[PDB]
């Protein structure tokens, strides 16, 4: 039961958002995921190292692994 774009989840377990993109990063090794935070609790605006993986509001883009992310819709 992996994650799908447009699904509600938690980035890092403490942050909440919606999955936008899933894949590796140009600055981090391994598999990563993109989640749009519900509030300004992120680090990027949907880009990393000059690479935009998805579109999201300012300080709403958070990049965290797929295992670190979980669906909030219990």
């Amino acid at each position: 039961r992996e994650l799908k774009i447009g699904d509600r989840v938690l980035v890092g377990g403490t942050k909440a958002g919606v999955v936008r993109f899933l894949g590796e990063t140009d600055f981090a090794k391994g598999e990563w995921c993109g989640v749009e935070l519900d509030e300004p609790l992120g680090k990027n605006d949907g880009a990393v190292a000059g690479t935009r993986y998805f579109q999201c509001q300012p300080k709403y883009g958070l990049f965290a692994p797929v295992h670190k992310v979980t669906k909030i819709g219990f």
């Binding site: 980035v11 958070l62 990049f63 965290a64 692994p65």
Partner: peptide, 8 residues
């Protein structure tokens, strides 16, 4: 804890 610092 469930590990932290794995997000950007």
């Amino acid at each position: 804890g469930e590990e932290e610092g794995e997000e950007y």
